[PDB]
Structure 1
Amino acid sequence: RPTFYRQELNKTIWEVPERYQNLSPVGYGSVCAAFDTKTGHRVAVKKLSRPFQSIIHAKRTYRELRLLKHMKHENVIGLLDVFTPARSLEEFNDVYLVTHLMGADLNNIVKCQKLTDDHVQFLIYQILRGLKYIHSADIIHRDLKPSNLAVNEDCELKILDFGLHTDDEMTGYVATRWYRAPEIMLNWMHYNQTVDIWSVGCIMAELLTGRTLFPGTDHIDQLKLILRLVGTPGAELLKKISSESARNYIQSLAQMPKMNFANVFIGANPLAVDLLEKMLVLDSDKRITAAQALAHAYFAQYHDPDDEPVADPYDQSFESRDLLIDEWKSLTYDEVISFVPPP
């Protein structure tokens, strides 16, 4: 056990191992930036807020720690350390998570930088390389958007902030909804991993034009923007939508054909236009997958099938398990004490 030291910053007690120095608040939890003297990295230290206050909260704490412990890929956020000052399960209450400190996100890049087609190729290639890994473990991210993509000066990218959202958070003219697949924004059906591929299409379109693809002022305005681009659904997709009311609303709209994407994304690389047509498909069964997209000719200068790895198997059976708060807490404590740091 390391030696801990205790200090109060911005009305919060932080008790952390001596290796973590120069704690500085930077904003589910509270977060400080710090310097890790053991590894030389600048890090983010997150102190969880009330992690075991309810069954839902205790299970969410366990879910987040299990997910972060599993992810070991160059294009995905991983866990550098996890610790508690508790010396026994009986006095266990606080959980701290340590990750690499991220600087710029993709928002900074799109708004403030002049991108070539080569930049778009490399950025989207890395998102898909990370998604092939995530999807191989039957994990769905659910919340891909520019603020959840970290990028550095050499254009290297990492996926973060997995979906572990309230009705109020998705209401109105908000970026929290503009990148979501229609079937999940509208609760049409049980959804699959290609909800994440719809998000990649929206992100790639924005990198090519500098503009949000579907900036709806509410859920239904956004659906109208989507159907104007990709066309209204046929009977084949309509049959897959659960709500009779939802089906009735969609059939109340005048029918529209799919638009010509070369006349929407004017001047873009024709191979980029082709890939967008394969991502932005309304019926999720027919969207391209991450593994299929990496083999598309748009990425010919980066694709290396011997350097696009898959994940170890991931056991999610806990998600269907009903336990008490103290049982979720004990499972979490076991995962804290068994953590083994990376090289």
Structure 2
Amino acid sequence: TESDWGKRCVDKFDIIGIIGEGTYGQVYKAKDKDTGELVALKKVRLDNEKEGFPITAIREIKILRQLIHRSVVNMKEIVTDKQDALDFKKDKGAFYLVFEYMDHDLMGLLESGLVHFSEDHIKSFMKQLMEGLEYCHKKNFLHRDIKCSNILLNNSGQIKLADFGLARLYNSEESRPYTNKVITLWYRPPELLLGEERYTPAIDVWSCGCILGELFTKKPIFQANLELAQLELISRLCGSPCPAVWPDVIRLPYFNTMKPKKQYRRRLREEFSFIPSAALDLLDHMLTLDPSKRCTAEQTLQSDFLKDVELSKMAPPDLPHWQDCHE
């Protein structure tokens, strides 16, 4: 049957190329021979067998087994390499997770500095983003890192959230260490920087707020390589963490250890004065330092910006598939 995963072989999926690289495998673009649909294969190698099937892979398997929302990427099935039936003790074959293929990642499109996102485009984008995140948070599944590379969007306009586990970026040979982590920092919430705390839904919402601003500038709002220099950039914009705004900032371990250079006043509305009022009010609420004070996902969906956005009106984004010759 279709519900019985783990028995079909990868021999049913023609491989087109390696779209991404992962810590425990590679990500290949492929076509199912029978269906004709384009899929994405995520390789999980348990051949080291140090501590078994990766827990990160298990997280993506558990969460996305039961999540089918339009705004989240869906796992179709899990296939295996050719396996000898004599014994599975002998077999060390890898397992591949089938996903719906996505055309572009938000990071790629903005890296051009050529694509233009109008207000309506951002509305369509953010509403899908938040609708998916609500569905996940309601199911008590939280995406601990929401990045720009994690946001996958096809040419039509649909937005999907991906990389709950088994991220699709790999660092090899000599390069900046943990480059993927450097990107993750740009969207990390202040609470996590200040302390380990517990994983809260707010950690998702802050990252999505960072994205919101990035869509109005085409540049990440906060870019830094060290946790202290990131906290300072946040403070220059959102204001330094203090009890006056954060009644529980003291409880965090590094509130006194990590300190912004000065105590800054909040300038978010001034440095973003070029953003529409309906949106700016959303940014201000999504970038509140305190997790409890930070707005929830449902509340974002009931914002002026996103409440009255028409889901039917997809309004595709304008992506340049011509004039790449230029001039």
The TM-score with structure 2 as length reference comes to 0.78
- Runs (4+) of structure 1 moved beyond 4 Å? 87-92, 163-168, 250-253
In the other structure, the counterpart of 1:12 is: none
Alpha carbons of structure 1 residues 260 and 69: separation in structure 2 relative to 1, 3 Å: closer
In the other structure, the counterpart of 2:63 is: 67
- Provide the C-alpha distance between the structure 1 equivalents of 2:180 and 2:211, rounded to a whole number of angstroms: 20
- Provide the C-alpha distance between the structure 1 equivalents of 2:180 and 2:163, rounded to a whole number of angstroms: 20
In the other structure, the counterpart of 1:218 is: 226
The Cα of 1:30 is off from its aligned counterpart by: 2.3
The Cα of 1:189 is off from its aligned counterpart by: 1.8
Q: Is the 8 A contact 1:171 1:218 kept in 2?
A: no
Does residue 137 in structure 1 map to residue 144 in structure 2? no
Does residue 169 in structure 1 map to residue 178 in structure 2? yes
The Cα of 1:301 is off from its aligned counterpart by: 3.0
In the other structure, the counterpart of 1:154 is: 156
Q: Is the 8 A contact 2:105 2:153 kept in 1?
A: yes
Alpha carbons of structure 1 residues 150 and 51: separation in structure 2 relative to 1, 3 Å: farther
What percentage of residue pairs aligned between the two structures are identical? Answer: 30
In the other structure, the counterpart of 1:341 is: none
Q: Identify which range, 272-281 or 154-163, moves more after superposition.
A: 154-163
Q: Is the 8 A contact 1:214 1:225 kept in 2?
A: yes
Alpha carbons of structure 1 residues 56 and 278: separation in structure 2 relative to 1, 3 Å: farther
The TM-score with structure 1 as length reference comes to 0.75
- Provide the C-alpha distance between the structure 1 equivalents of 2:257 and 2:281, rounded to a whole number of angstroms: 31
Q: Identify which range, 81-90 or 108-117, moves more after superposition.
A: 81-90
- Provide the C-alpha distance between the structure 2 equivalents of 1:198 and 1:57, rounded to a whole number of angstroms: 31
In the other structure, the counterpart of 1:238 is: 249
Aligned counterpart for 1:295 among listed residues 293, 297, 302: 302
Alpha carbons of structure 1 residues 83 and 188: separation in structure 2 relative to 1, 3 Å: closer
- Provide the C-alpha distance between the structure 1 equivalents of 2:276 and 2:260, rounded to a whole number of angstroms: 36
In the other structure, the counterpart of 1:201 is: 209
SS of 1:146's equivalent? coil
Does residue 120 in structure 1 map to residue 116 in structure 2? no
Aligned counterpart for 1:37 among listed residues 26, 33, 37: 33
Q: Is the 8 A contact 2:190 2:231 kept in 1?
A: yes
- Correspondence list, 1:266-285, <5 A: 266-285=273-292
Which consecutive unaligned segments of at least 5 residues does structure 2 have? 3-7, 312-327
Per residue, is there more helix in 1 or in 2? 1
Deviation per CA, 1:134-188: give whole Å up to 9, x if none: 111111101111111111222211000014699952799x323101112223434
Alpha carbons of structure 1 residues 35 and 57: separation in structure 2 relative to 1, 3 Å: closer
Q: Is the 8 A contact 1:228 1:258 kept in 2?
A: yes
In the other structure, the counterpart of 2:321 is: none
The Cα of 1:281 is off from its aligned counterpart by: 0.7
Alpha carbons of structure 1 residues 281 and 81: separation in structure 2 relative to 1, 3 Å: same
Alpha carbons of structure 1 residues 190 and 170: separation in structure 2 relative to 1, 3 Å: farther
The Cα of 1:58 is off from its aligned counterpart by: 4.5
The Cα of 1:199 is off from its aligned counterpart by: 0.2
Deviation per CA, 1:84-127: give whole Å up to 9, x if none: 34446545533121112222111233333111111111111111
In the other structure, the counterpart of 1:100 is: 100
Q: Is the 8 A contact 2:29 2:40 kept in 1?
A: yes
- Provide the C-alpha distance between the structure 2 equivalents of 1:68 and 1:43, rounded to a whole number of angstroms: 15
- Provide the C-alpha distance between the structure 2 equivalents of 1:31 and 1:247, rounded to a whole number of angstroms: 40
Alpha carbons of structure 1 residues 171 and 219: separation in structure 2 relative to 1, 3 Å: farther
User: Structure 1 counterpart of 2:287, which letter?
Assistant: L
In the other structure, the counterpart of 1:53 is: 49
In the other structure, the counterpart of 1:5 is: none
- Provide the C-alpha distance between the structure 2 equivalents of 1:209 and 1:96, rounded to a whole number of angstroms: 37
User: Structure 2 counterpart of 1:211, which letter?
Assistant: K
Alpha carbons of structure 1 residues 171 and 119: separation in structure 2 relative to 1, 3 Å: closer
In the other structure, the counterpart of 2:265 is: 257
Q: Identify which range, 42-51 or 83-92, moves more after superposition.
A: 83-92
Alpha carbons of structure 1 residues 164 and 102: separation in structure 2 relative to 1, 3 Å: closer
The Cα of 1:230 is off from its aligned counterpart by: 1.2
Deviation per CA, 1:176-220: give whole Å up to 9, x if none: 310111222343422311100000110010101222101123211
- Correspondence list, 1:176-187, <5 A: 176-187=184-195
The Cα of 1:16 is off from its aligned counterpart by: 3.5
User: Structure 2 counterpart of 1:25, which letter?
Assistant: I
- Provide the C-alpha distance between the structure 2 equivalents of 1:34 and 1:239, rounded to a whole number of angstroms: 51
User: Structure 2 counterpart of 1:214, which letter?
Assistant: F
Q: Is the 8 A contact 2:240 2:260 kept in 1?
A: no
Deviation per CA, 1:225-246: give whole Å up to 9, x if none: 10111112233132331x2xx2
**CA RMSD for the aligned pairs?**
2.9
